CSV table of C-alpha atoms in Angstrom, one decimal:
chain,number,residue,atom,x,y,z
A,1,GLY,CA,107.6,71.8,108.8
A,2,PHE,CA,109.6,69.8,106.3
A,3,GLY,CA,107.1,67.0,106.5
A,4,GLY,CA,105.6,68.1,109.8
A,5,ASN,CA,104.0,71.5,110.2
A,6,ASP,CA,106.3,73.8,112.1
A,7,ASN,CA,105.1,77.2,113.4
A,8,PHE,CA,108.0,79.6,113.8
A,9,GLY,CA,105.6,82.3,115.1
B,1,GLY,CA,92.9,72.2,114.6
B,2,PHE,CA,94.3,75.5,115.9
B,3,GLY,CA,97.8,74.2,114.9
B,4,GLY,CA,99.1,77.8,114.9
B,5,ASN,CA,100.6,80.2,117.5
B,6,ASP,CA,97.3,81.5,118.7
B,7,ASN,CA,96.8,84.5,121.0
B,8,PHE,CA,93.2,84.7,122.1
B,9,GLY,CA,93.9,88.2,123.4
C,1,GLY,CA,98.5,92.4,122.6
C,2,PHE,CA,96.1,94.6,124.5
C,3,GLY,CA,93.5,91.9,124.1
C,4,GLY,CA,90.9,93.9,126.0
C,5,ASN,CA,87.9,92.2,127.5
C,6,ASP,CA,87.3,89.1,125.4
C,7,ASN,CA,84.3,86.9,126.5
C,8,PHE,CA,84.9,83.6,124.7
C,9,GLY,CA,82.2,81.0,124.4
D,1,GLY,CA,86.1,101.3,135.8
D,2,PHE,CA,87.3,104.9,135.6
D,3,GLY,CA,90.0,104.1,133.1
D,4,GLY,CA,89.7,100.4,133.6
D,5,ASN,CA,88.8,98.5,130.5
D,6,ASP,CA,86.2,96.6,132.6
D,7,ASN,CA,84.1,93.7,131.4
D,8,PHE,CA,80.7,93.4,133.3
D,9,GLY,CA,80.4,90.2,131.2
E,1,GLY,CA,70.5,102.4,141.7
E,2,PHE,CA,66.9,101.1,142.1
E,3,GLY,CA,65.8,104.3,143.7
E,4,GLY,CA,68.6,106.6,142.7
E,5,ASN,CA,70.5,107.5,139.6
E,6,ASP,CA,73.8,105.8,138.6
E,7,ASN,CA,76.2,106.2,135.7
E,8,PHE,CA,78.7,103.9,134.0
E,9,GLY,CA,82.1,105.6,134.0
F,1,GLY,CA,72.0,120.0,147.5
F,2,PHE,CA,74.2,117.0,146.9
F,3,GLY,CA,76.3,115.5,144.1
F,4,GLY,CA,76.5,111.8,143.3
F,5,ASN,CA,78.3,109.3,141.1
F,6,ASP,CA,81.0,111.6,139.6
F,7,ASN,CA,83.9,110.4,137.6
F,8,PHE,CA,86.4,113.2,137.1
F,9,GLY,CA,89.7,114.2,135.5
G,1,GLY,CA,94.5,127.7,138.6
G,2,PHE,CA,90.8,127.6,139.7
G,3,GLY,CA,90.6,129.5,143.0
G,4,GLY,CA,87.4,130.3,144.7
G,5,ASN,CA,84.9,128.2,146.5
G,6,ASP,CA,84.0,125.3,144.3
G,7,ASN,CA,82.3,122.4,146.1
G,8,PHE,CA,82.8,119.5,143.8
G,9,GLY,CA,79.5,117.8,145.0
H,1,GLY,CA,94.2,115.1,137.7
H,2,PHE,CA,93.6,118.3,139.6
H,3,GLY,CA,96.8,120.2,138.9
H,4,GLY,CA,99.1,117.2,139.0
H,5,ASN,CA,99.0,115.9,135.4
H,6,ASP,CA,98.2,112.2,136.1
H,7,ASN,CA,99.0,109.6,133.4
H,8,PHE,CA,96.3,106.9,133.7
H,9,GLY,CA,97.6,105.0,130.6
I,1,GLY,CA,110.4,116.6,129.2
I,2,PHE,CA,108.5,113.5,128.1
I,3,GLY,CA,106.0,112.6,130.7
I,4,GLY,CA,103.4,110.0,129.7
I,5,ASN,CA,103.9,106.2,129.7
I,6,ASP,CA,105.3,106.0,126.2
I,7,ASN,CA,106.8,102.5,125.7
I,8,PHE,CA,109.9,103.0,123.5
I,9,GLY,CA,109.4,99.5,122.0
J,1,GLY,CA,76.7,86.3,134.9
J,2,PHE,CA,78.6,84.8,132.0
J,3,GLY,CA,76.2,81.9,131.4
J,4,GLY,CA,73.4,83.7,133.3
J,5,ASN,CA,71.5,86.9,133.4
J,6,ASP,CA,71.6,90.1,135.4
J,7,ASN,CA,69.3,93.0,136.2
J,8,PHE,CA,71.1,96.3,137.0
J,9,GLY,CA,67.8,97.6,138.5
K,1,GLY,CA,59.7,79.3,134.8
K,2,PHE,CA,63.1,80.9,135.6
K,3,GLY,CA,61.7,84.3,134.9
K,4,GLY,CA,64.3,86.2,136.9
K,5,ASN,CA,65.7,89.7,136.5
K,6,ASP,CA,62.6,91.7,137.5
K,7,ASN,CA,62.1,94.9,139.5
K,8,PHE,CA,58.6,95.1,140.7
K,9,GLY,CA,59.1,98.8,141.2
L,1,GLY,CA,53.3,100.0,144.0
L,2,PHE,CA,51.4,96.8,143.9
L,3,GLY,CA,50.0,97.4,147.4
L,4,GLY,CA,50.4,101.1,147.8
L,5,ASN,CA,51.7,104.3,146.4
L,6,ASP,CA,55.5,105.0,146.5
L,7,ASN,CA,56.9,108.2,145.1
L,8,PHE,CA,60.4,108.8,143.7
L,9,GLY,CA,62.7,111.6,142.8
M,1,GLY,CA,44.8,93.2,146.5
M,2,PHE,CA,46.9,90.8,144.5
M,3,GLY,CA,45.4,87.9,146.3
M,4,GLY,CA,44.9,84.6,144.5
M,5,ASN,CA,47.8,82.2,144.3
M,6,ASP,CA,50.4,84.2,142.3
M,7,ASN,CA,54.1,83.8,141.5
M,8,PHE,CA,55.8,87.2,141.8
M,9,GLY,CA,59.1,86.4,140.1
N,1,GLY,CA,104.3,96.7,120.7
N,2,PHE,CA,107.0,94.5,119.3
N,3,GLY,CA,109.7,96.4,117.5
N,4,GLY,CA,112.2,93.6,117.3
N,5,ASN,CA,114.7,95.8,115.5
N,6,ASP,CA,114.6,99.2,117.0
N,7,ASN,CA,117.8,101.2,116.8
N,8,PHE,CA,117.6,104.5,118.6
N,9,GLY,CA,119.3,107.7,119.8
O,1,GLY,CA,120.5,112.0,121.0
O,2,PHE,CA,117.0,111.5,122.3
O,3,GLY,CA,116.8,113.8,125.3
O,4,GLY,CA,120.5,113.9,125.7
O,5,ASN,CA,122.2,115.6,122.8
O,6,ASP,CA,124.7,113.1,121.5
O,7,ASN,CA,127.6,113.7,119.1
O,8,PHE,CA,128.1,110.6,116.9
O,9,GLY,CA,130.8,112.1,114.8
P,1,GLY,CA,83.1,77.0,121.9
P,2,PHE,CA,86.4,76.1,120.2
P,3,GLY,CA,86.3,72.3,119.8
P,4,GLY,CA,83.4,72.0,122.4
P,5,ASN,CA,79.7,71.9,122.1
P,6,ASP,CA,79.0,74.2,125.0
P,7,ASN,CA,75.3,74.8,125.0
P,8,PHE,CA,74.2,77.6,127.3
P,9,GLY,CA,70.8,76.0,127.8
Q,1,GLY,CA,117.9,84.5,112.5
Q,2,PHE,CA,115.5,82.3,110.5
Q,3,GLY,CA,112.6,83.0,112.8
Q,4,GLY,CA,112.8,86.6,113.6
Q,5,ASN,CA,114.5,90.0,113.4
Q,6,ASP,CA,118.2,90.7,112.9
Q,7,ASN,CA,119.0,94.4,113.5
Q,8,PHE,CA,122.5,94.5,112.1
Q,9,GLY,CA,124.5,97.6,113.0
R,1,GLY,CA,127.5,98.7,113.6
R,2,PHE,CA,125.8,101.6,115.2
R,3,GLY,CA,129.1,103.5,115.1
R,4,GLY,CA,131.7,101.3,113.6
R,5,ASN,CA,132.0,100.8,109.8
R,6,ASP,CA,130.9,97.5,108.5
R,7,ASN,CA,132.2,95.2,105.8
R,8,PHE,CA,131.0,92.0,104.1
R,9,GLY,CA,132.9,89.6,101.9
S,1,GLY,CA,143.6,107.6,112.0
S,2,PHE,CA,142.5,104.0,112.6
S,3,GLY,CA,142.2,102.1,109.3
S,4,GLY,CA,139.4,100.0,110.7
S,5,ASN,CA,138.2,96.8,109.0
S,6,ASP,CA,140.1,95.5,105.9
S,7,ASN,CA,140.0,92.4,103.8
S,8,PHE,CA,143.0,91.9,101.5
S,9,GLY,CA,143.9,89.1,99.1
T,1,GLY,CA,134.2,83.4,106.2
T,2,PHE,CA,136.5,85.0,103.7
T,3,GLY,CA,137.1,81.5,102.2
T,4,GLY,CA,133.6,80.2,101.6
T,5,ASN,CA,130.0,81.4,101.7
T,6,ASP,CA,127.9,82.6,104.6
T,7,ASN,CA,124.2,82.5,105.6
T,8,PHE,CA,122.3,85.0,107.7
T,9,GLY,CA,119.0,83.9,109.0
U,1,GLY,CA,146.8,87.5,96.2
U,2,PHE,CA,148.5,90.8,97.2
U,3,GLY,CA,152.1,90.0,96.3
U,4,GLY,CA,151.3,86.4,95.4
U,5,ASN,CA,148.3,84.9,93.6
U,6,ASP,CA,145.3,83.0,95.0
U,7,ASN,CA,142.5,80.9,93.7
U,8,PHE,CA,139.4,81.4,95.8
U,9,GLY,CA,137.0,79.6,93.4
V,1,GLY,CA,130.7,67.6,97.0
V,2,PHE,CA,130.0,70.0,99.9
V,3,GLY,CA,126.3,70.2,100.5
V,4,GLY,CA,127.1,73.5,102.2
V,5,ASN,CA,125.4,75.2,105.1
V,6,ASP,CA,121.7,75.6,104.8
V,7,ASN,CA,118.8,75.9,107.2
V,8,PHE,CA,115.7,73.7,106.8
V,9,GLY,CA,112.3,73.2,108.4
W,1,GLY,CA,156.0,96.2,92.0
W,2,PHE,CA,154.6,99.0,94.2
W,3,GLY,CA,157.5,100.4,96.3
W,4,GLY,CA,156.9,103.2,98.6
W,5,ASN,CA,154.9,104.1,101.7
W,6,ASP,CA,151.5,102.8,100.6
W,7,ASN,CA,149.3,103.2,103.6
W,8,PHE,CA,147.0,100.4,102.4
W,9,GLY,CA,144.6,101.3,105.1
X,1,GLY,CA,106.0,60.5,103.2
X,2,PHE,CA,109.2,61.1,101.4
X,3,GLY,CA,110.7,57.7,100.9
X,4,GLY,CA,113.7,57.1,98.7
X,5,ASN,CA,117.4,57.4,99.4
X,6,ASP,CA,117.7,61.2,99.3
X,7,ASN,CA,121.0,62.6,100.7
X,8,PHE,CA,120.1,65.9,102.4
X,9,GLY,CA,123.6,67.2,101.9
């Protein structure tokens, strides 16, 4: 999510 | 893709 | 939530 | 089916 | 049915 | 004479 | 309170 | 259903 | 006297 | 019949 | 032919 | 039908 | 009198 | 059906 | 106090 | 379907 | 909580 | 919280 | 007569 | 922390 | 800093 | 040179 | 120079 | 693809 697409959902 | 938190139902 | 009767293809 | 949410798909 | 009546619910 | 497929309450 | 002969047929 | 309140939810 | 299937949620 | 057909005759 | 789903009442 | 009469009801 | 070669289905 | 913050009573 | 008559005070 | 060709016929 | 609900108090 | 007073800072 | 939470200084 | 800052969430 | 003096900064 | 406390991602 | 029963509470 | 010398403090 900072470079790589995190999904806290 | 579908990189998200996906429910489908 | 109540995702009922999904027919996916 | 009598209150069942049934598919018949 | 084939020869008699039938309903869905 | 006779009743049949009968959903009820 | 129903009360007589009813014959759910 | 009849007199007993059911609760099919 | 609640009686149903209420989900306090 | 999900990938199929049905009759209900 | 796969003509299925017939009633030949 | 096809070969002979058939009544219904 | 359906008589000649015939596919019913 | 997701009250994540439900204070009650 | 939801069915139970509380007294937060 | 999702990410799949999935031909019925 | 950085992903979801707090409910302070 | 809920019953007790709160403070911050 | 509880004086509860307190932050001095 | 009554000395330095906080974060919630 | 209640009877003395303090430098939170 | 405190960076301090901070969530990321 | 406060000097009595203060009840800082 | 960040790439320098970046000091997440």
